[PDB]
Amino acid sequence: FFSGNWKAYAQNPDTASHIFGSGEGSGTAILTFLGGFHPQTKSLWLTDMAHHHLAIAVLFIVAGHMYRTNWLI
Amino acid sequence: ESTYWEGKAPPSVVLGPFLSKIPSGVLGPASLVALIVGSYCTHESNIFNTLTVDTIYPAYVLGSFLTPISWGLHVAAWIQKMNKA
Amino acid sequence: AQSKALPFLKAPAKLDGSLAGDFGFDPMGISDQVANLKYVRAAELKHCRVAMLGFLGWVVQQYVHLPGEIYAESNPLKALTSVPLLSQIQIFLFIGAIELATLDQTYTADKPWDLGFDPLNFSKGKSEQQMKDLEVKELKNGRVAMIAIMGLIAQTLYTGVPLF
Amino acid sequence: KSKAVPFLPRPAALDGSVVGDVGFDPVGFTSWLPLSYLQEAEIKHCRIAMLATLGWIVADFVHLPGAVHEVSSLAAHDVAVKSGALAQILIWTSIAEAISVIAISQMLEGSGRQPGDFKFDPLNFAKDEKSLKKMQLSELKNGRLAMLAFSGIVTQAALTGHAFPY
Ligand code: CLA
Ligand SMILES: C/C(C=C=C1C(C)(C)C[C@H](O)C[C@@]1(C)O)=C/C=C/C(C)=C/C=C/C=C(C)/C=C/C=C(/C=C/[C@@]12O[C@]1(C)C[C@@H](O)CC2(C)C)CO
Ligand SMILES: CC(/C=C/C=C(C)/C=C/[C@@]12O[C@]1(C)C[C@@H](O)CC2(C)C)=C\C=C\C=C(C)\C=C\C=C(C)\C=C\[C@@]12O[C@]1(C)C[C@@H](O)CC2(C)C
Question: Which residues contact C84 (CB under 8 A, 6 or more apart)?
């Protein structure tokens, strides 16, 4: 994150044989684009939703500086 | 103050006290350059070369952000030009 | 200009003169929202006193322990879990008993931090200048302790060494 | 009309300032921004560049009170962000700059704070206004020279690998 090598958080995502709640077939990534659903739970990837909320957080924090307050801008 | 307007163009105060003082001959070419740069950055990050995890290029991203901006710069350029600036 | 702590900024309107320890330190202008400085001073002084006691307890627990085994833990954060819940609930109930009457007191009084606590009468006979000097001493020591107790907690949570 | 550029006219916003006003603003940036904000930015750049030039030069010559400090001020950045020193300097710099927002916002709004003024004269090197103006001009000239010098130092020390000559 500090080094800017943000791709490292997307390397080695959860495989297609991952059993939810277990380490079998898991990965190490935390923020990924995968799209679709988990092959086992038939639901969105947890790494997809974490990345989604991080992007939403950055966007809303940026957008929260729009209106004027005690600092002239 | 009084950003309300009814003439041909709004007063320069609507541009803020940073764009209110830019000559239109500066904003115009700057807006065109920003639009061209942003379009090229968007077409280089995507379209011409498909996006990949290993290829994000903050320059192209930050660049692409100049396209939305360009819109604002040339709007301000027109406003300055019509206000004799 | 008017801030002594930040010699370049001008202090906010409510930072002036009285309420000892006033060094013009409110860059964010938090005092501009509070109706008065009574409640924030009460909170600051409560934090100062709790932090002084916390630092003293941190050091003493580092060096001195009660005869019982349950109080033999040297790490204060580990002692937070090793000590039986009975002792901690007794401490919490004592604090809450002290806190409810002062809860009635703080939100309305002119000096919410003045709890009338002076068993040794260290303030009887002291002049106004001496009393203000004592208040300044208390506030200084409390702010330094707050910084210190937070540093001790952080270094224990980050390295496991409770001291030095 | 300008003192620095005889051809181009004198900038409209530059009439007199003890900061070294020689009327050098060919692109008219002083018309864009308030002059005070630009002066604060220039003084900040001056001080940062002076500190950085001195630090680069010294740390390449005599800087090793340990093991991790055995670098050549070109690989020093990565080594010492791994060590954790740069993190602490960044924390304190961020605190100072966050305070500086209010200082910049208290000016440009009223008050009386001159650009770049932090009331930091513990040794009282400046006594009266004349000394203050003379040393403000001296500080800004030294800071501009240090900006250019540090630019040269980094560009040369990245174009090759060497010592003080670079
Ligand atoms: C619980 C903490 C606490 C509280 C409630 C106060 C409250 C007060 N202080 Mg104070 N102070 C504190 C801690 C605190 N202080 C510490 C630790 C120091 C030492 C640096 C000081 C140093 C100080 C000075 C020098 C002065 C004051 C003054 C004041 C008064 C006016 C400012 C105000 O309204 O801010 C209210 C403050 C809060 C509501 C706290 C908000 C919490 C913020 C967001 C802190 C965020 C964390 C922080 C950035 C980092 C902490 C982590 C770690 C590094 C410590 C007010 C009674 C001024 C005074 O006497 O006026 C009468 C004055 O001149 N304080
Ligand atoms: C203990 C230690 C290290 C070590 C050791 C041992 C125990 C000693 C020995 C062992 O053998 C090894 C080891 C590792 O353990 C000590 C570390 C060194 C320290 C403690 C020195 C810190 C350096 C300070 C710097 C480099 C700060 C730079 C200043 C800036 C200012 C920025 C400004 O922009 C701001 C924000 C406002 C502007 O207006 C103007 C200015 C002021 C210019 C940054 O630009
Ligand atoms: C306890 C204290 C004061 C206690 C006073 C009390 C109870 C007085 C009570 C009374 O007067 C009243 C109220 C009313 C009177 O009628 C009755 C009595 C009863 C007489 C002040 C402490 C004040 C404590 C202070 C100021 C502490 C500062 C601590 C620092 C700087 C520590 C730094 C470090 O801990 C770090 C940060 C990291 C470590 O690794 C390294 C080091 C260096 C050890």
Answer: C70
Rounded to the nearest angstrom, the minimum Cα separation between D99 and chain C is: 7
CB D18 within 8 A of CB D133: yes
Cα–Cα distance for residue pair B15/C99, rounded to 1 Å? 55
Q: Are B11 and B3 in contact (CB under 8 A)?
A: yes
Q: Does residue C152 line the site of ligand 3, with CB under 6 A?
A: yes
On whether any CB of chain C is under 8 Å from the CB of D117, the answer is yes
* Nearest of D40, D45, D44, D43 to residue D106 by alpha carbon: D40
Give burial (CB, 10 Å; 0-12/13-18/19+) of D159. exposed
* Atom 28 in ligand 2: residue holding the nearest Cα: D89
Query: Cβ of D118 under 8 Å from any chain B Cβ?
Result: no
d(CA D96, CA C101): 41
**Locus of tokens 């966007």:** A59
Amino acid at A59: L
* DSSP E strand boundaries for chain D: none
Q: Which of C1, C7, C9 sits opposite D102 (nearest CB)?
A: C9
Q: Which residues sit opposite B37 in a β-bridge?
A: none
* Smallest CA–CA distance from B55 into chain A, residue: A7
Tell me the three state secondary structure of residue C154. helix
**Cβ atoms D150, D57 nearer than 8 A:** no
Q: How far is CA D36 from each of CA C69, C124, D30, rounded to the nearest angstrom? A: 66, 54, 9
C138: nearest Cα among C28, C16, C48:
C48
Please give the interface size between B and D, counted as residue pairs whose CB atoms are below 8 Å apart: 5
Residue C121, helix vs strand vs coil: coil
- Subunits with 3+ Cβ pairs within 8 Å of C are D
Elucidation technique: cryo-EM
Nearest ligand 2 atom, CA D116: 39
The answer to whether the CB of A71 falls within 8 A of the CB of D105 is yes
D153 CA: distance to closest CA in chain C (Å)? 34
Map tokens 């090598």 to a residue.
A5
Q: Are C49 and C115 in contact (CB under 8 A)?
A: no
